[PDB]
Every structure is written in structure tokens, then in C-alpha cells.
From a paper:
Glucuronoyl esterases (GEs) within the carbohydrate esterase family 15 ([name]) esterase family, in a range of aerobic and anaerobic fungi and bacteria, have been identified as playing an important role in breaking down LCCs by cleaving the ester bond between 4-O-methyl-d-glucuronyl in xylan and alcohol groups in lignin. GEs share an invariant Ser-His-Glu/Asp catalytic triad and employ a conserved catalytic mechanism that involves the formation of an acyl-enzyme covalent intermediate, which is subsequently cleaved through acid-base hydrolysis. Rumen GEs adopt a canonical α/β hydrolase fold: FsCE15, PrCE15, and RfCE15 adopted the canonical α/β-hydrolase fold that is seen in all of the GE structures solved to date.
Crystals of FsCE15 belonged to space group P41212 with a single protein molecule in the asymmetric unit. The structure of FsCE15 was refined to Rwork/Rfree of 22.8%/28.5% (respectively) using data to a maximum resolution of 1.93 Å. FsCE15 has a broad pH profile with maximal activity at pH 8.0. This observation is supported by our phylogenetic analysis showing that FsCE15 clustered closely with Neocallimastigomycota carbohydrate esterase family 15 esterases. FsCE15 also possesses structural features that are typically observed in fungal GEs including: a shallow active site lacking any of the insertions in the Reg1-Reg3 regions, catalytic residues that adopt a canonical [name]-A active site conformation, and a conserved disulfide bond in the active site.
Author numbering: 155 to 251, 254 to 265, 270 to 538
Write the structure that this text describes.
Amino acid sequence: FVEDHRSECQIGNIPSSVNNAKLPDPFMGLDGKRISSKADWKCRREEIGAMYEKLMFGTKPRNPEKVEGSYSGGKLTIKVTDKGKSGSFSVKISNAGDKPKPAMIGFGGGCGSLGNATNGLDIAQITFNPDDVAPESGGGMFFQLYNQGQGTIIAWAWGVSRIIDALEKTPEAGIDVKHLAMTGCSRWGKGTLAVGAFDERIALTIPQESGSGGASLWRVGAQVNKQKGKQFVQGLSSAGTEGKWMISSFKNYDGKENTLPFDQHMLVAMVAPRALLILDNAGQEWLGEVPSNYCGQASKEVYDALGATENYTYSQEGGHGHCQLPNGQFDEVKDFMNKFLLGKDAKTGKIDYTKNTQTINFKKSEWIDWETPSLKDP
Ligand SMILES: [Zn+2]
Ligand SMILES: [Zn+2]
């Protein structure tokens, strides 16, 4: 039970430019060799994260000197010691536990945007206000401790990682750290994806309407915008500027998405093989209906290769308001939370899109020219 295995893996050269109008291969090691075993994924996963930290998010500070947790009055207060100073933040908690309880962590300050989809599930709720660590205006407690030009998203992933640190040594909070989910919508759907991708202790990642910078293909977004003759979908530059989410260099890819050494199917692949339920909308122009769908479809290759097809679902339902989840997706939320948080079996693993407003025609031959290997068991 571990945040990541980065220190167990040798990270080689990270190029910042390629020439590839197709999706980059996620099974291609930095050492130039394709992986063949499921055991090779431990380190291949770290190599992808290191690429995102170098190229898009910024470096995730690791191994903090000390994390202290205290639980009082339904609020968990986390004090982090690092780099000569201290930084503190607190999260609200609902439900409790001698008898620890599985928990959903949600951006807020509401706790995420799943609404009544969780009603009837005896799980705890932890609200994380990302402004406590890194407001989109800049500044924040994170940047009191650190100063390597990171963006705000990786500061939120750091934040949630420190919540889990404090939880592991605060049993009076009454939370089962072995059964934790993460969720959030829109800007906090981009935040949720990165959170679950960069902390392996998140057992269920539920990014909602995460859009550009989230689970949406940079190359497909740029294609759609060329087909429309205008910025129909939120483009790379805009996602690389808004909210200080990304490092300042990332927006320089904007006219040249084919030079990206990655695409967002590889961020999704950082969550594998842990459970991942992507809740998407449709008919939202800026959100990117087609590039999000195509990211959803393309990302299945890594989960299939690891033999974890049952742990990944992309669910797109349009025809409803932004971040207001329709009842047609309540069954998804309940099935995954029962399965991966509460130990109750359910049929999971699906690629489903309905109530679209654009033509959905994902042809693997256009976007994927690498074979999906058969990763062997050791
Ligand atoms: Zn690992
Ligand atoms: Zn459903």
C-alpha cells in the first residue's frame, strides 16, 4: 500500500517533441523496448507519470518529511512538514467508524457532483477544497512549500495524497484507507483524473465531464477545431492557460499537437489497472464530445492488455445540464462503488455513449497504428 513506485524505476530520456499524428504507444518503454509482461507495467506507469510531470503538470513533490493528522469536530486537519516550513489544511468528513468505513473524496467548497447517485451507499464523504492548497488565481499553501513552477492540478494531486497520508495514521477519523474513491466534475474532473493517476491508493477514480486537459485527446480536439473552422472544442492553448492548471511551457504545443510525445489516453492509462469510471456529457461544445469519446474508446487498450477490462467504463450521456448527473448513470456509480469500495460484486466494464449530438465514428485504424500486446502473467 503505497502512493507510487517511482523510486523503484529508472527513468530514461523524456523527449519533448515527436512527429506522430496518431496516438503515441503507451506500451513503448523509455528505454526503447515494448513491454511484454504485466510486471513491466509497474515501471512503465511511472515513466508515463514522469513524462506528464516534465511536460504538462510539473513535478509532484514526493516523500514529505512529516505528515500529521488530527481529527476533531468532524474535521480532519493535515499538517505537512517539508522544505524548512509547515503547511496545514483541513477536510470535512461525514460518516465515521474500530470499524473503518470506505470513503469518497470529492472536490468542493457539495462533495463532488454525483448527486443522488450515492444515496443508499453507507460510505463516508470527505470534502477537499482545492483552494486550501492551490487556488486557480495562484499562490496557496502548496507554493509556500514548493517553487518548481508546478501547475495547480498537480498541487491538488499532492493535496489528496497528503489526505491519505494523514488518514493512514488517524484511525479515529474512522475511514478505511484501503477503499477510497475520488470524484469531481469539470475543472475538478481534470483534477480527479490526475489525482487517481498519481496516487495508487485511490481504488476508484470517477472523473466527471473532465473535458480538455482531462480525458480528451489533444489530437482529436485539434482535428475537430479544424473541421469546424473555429474553436468549437476548448483547444490546447486555452486548457494550457486557464486556471494555472498546467506548467507555463505546455501551451507552446498549441499549433503543433502532432509533436506531443503523449496523448490523454496515456494519463487515463496511469490509473490502470485500478477501477476507473468516466462520466461524460454530450452536446457541450467546449467540453469536447468527440475528443472525449475518442479518448474513452482509445483508452481501453491498456486495461484490456493488463486483463482488467472489467475495471474500466466510459459512460457518455448527453441531453442534460453541466455537472448535473442524469439518473441513467446512477447505475454506473452504484455498480462501481459497490464493487470496488463495498465488496459487493457487479457486472462492470463497458464502452457506452448515448444522446450524442455529433457523428461518433472512432476508427482504430485512423488513431492507433501500434498493436495492443498480450501482457503475460509472471
Ligand atoms: Zn505502482
Ligand atoms: Zn446507466
